[PDB]
Amino acid sequence: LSDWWHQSVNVVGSYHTRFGPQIRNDTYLEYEAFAKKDWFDFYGYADAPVPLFMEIEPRFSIDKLTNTDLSFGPFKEWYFANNYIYDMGRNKDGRQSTWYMGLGTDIDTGLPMSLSMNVYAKYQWQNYGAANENEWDGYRFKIKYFVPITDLWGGQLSYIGFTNFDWGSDLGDDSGNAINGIKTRTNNSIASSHILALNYDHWHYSVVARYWHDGGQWNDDAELNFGNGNFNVRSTGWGGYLVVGYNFHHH
Template sequence: MVTDRTSEPGGAPSPLRQPVMTRSSLLAALGVVAAALVPLQAAHAQQSADEESAAPVIEQETPAEGPTSPEQTADSPYLSDWYHQNLTAIGSKNIRFGPQQVDDIYLEYEFFGRKGPLDLYGYIDFPKFFGVGNGADSGIFDNGSPVFMELEPKLSIDDMVGRDLSVGPVKEWFVAFDYIFDWGHNTENRQNTLYAGLGADFDTGSPLGLSLNLYKRRQWENYGAANEHSWDGYRAQLNYSYPLGSFDNGASLVYVGFTNHDFGSDLGDKDPSRTNESTVATNVLLYQFTHLRFMAVARYFHNGGQWNDGVTAPFPDTHGDSFELRSTGWGYYFGVGWQF
């Protein structure tokens, strides 16, 4: 998650807005996330029944070993047996995708699931939806971006060719995409980026879910940056999740994480305030019931948004003063949502 704003003073591009939970709500990032988010209380109930030798319990599917979301039974409490959704109010602090740190409170609609060869993840953000943010923040109601979205579909190569292509620890191969769109009010405040490549899910022999995607980047609009309308660089994306436990009150606790490393760009060669590489590592704790869920996120940025940490920005801040770019450090998110 990030925040779009109106044009920075001096005609500088708006900062990039990105998901918290990328693939999240840092769910992301990911089929891995999707599996981790499926409620675990059914398994807990079954275990209790076995221990007490009680009457048989109708079993529901629980997360399998893979990163994809299992289909629910006919008794599923959700609207779809494979397409899972949630709506979350998120507060963010010290987000470093742009030249200035952004604080924002916004609304996010998130969706994910697996059906046939399609493994889908995505979200739509409505920036500054509640009218709260710092001076660098703008959004849907104050001439900022009304919508920021990310769509991450993967197509199973194994399913499409009808063969098991697993080898070693790799249990499934994918054609993977990551499309990011920020609908700024003009081209200087808009992003339009496609990552395309290959993905793999791994068998870890444990409850740990693990996947890796390698992308090449096609950059169209990018807030007026010098790499617009070009093929510019690559991204390595590692996604991981681990169920931490379930509780007597029906809640479950899940850790979800993902790391994006962008490299091989030429942007830093064209602009000394930018870099050719950038890394963002996201760590999420999800405490959730069947519908209600709580999210806490710590995200580490290294040259977030490919801004060169420590150099003087080539444009003034919102007060007309010069400032130093602070694109390396921690940012935080907290959210309350409803799964349906």
């Protein structure tokens, strides 16, 4: 319902994406959803081409549920936090099921913005047949913030930023080496997003700048050859997205 549950369908164009071995630029339909109802907040999305990829972020309030004011310092609340990534792929081979679970919170910066932090431990199921499949592998720290800016062109301009820090994975150690002599995969990785979004009653446009450091744990510069000759992995660098979508809600 419009009250708390927010929906939106979007068309996204991406440029120089870095979660895989090779650089990519795609376009696709996306289904987004945000929600906040006393003991549960949520954010998630599903992408589909011109098979299916989705990432959901559900968190449950340890306060509301434990009916105890865990409030302390700038820490307004505490959550059982989750970050689940799923990629259907074309074969059980190009599939991914990742589950980050942990502790998350909301910070009060006294500033006119929203800020959240979450630490997760994760269990890895399918992962494109990589070495870290089916096992507890790595941790992740997620920091995200929302910053209302002003009213620009009749709509409302805002800034959304979030970064995912991953470390302690066992891949990279367990993967092989490249032609390069350097390991192919990586134990850690960073993906930082910066979003400038324009919102009207229903339509919205967003520009997204995104930076990877060893994207998808692919060790930057690793030299590989998938059968078309040697090439070097470009997993560290920028890429971006253009987003046009429509938010639904009765009047």
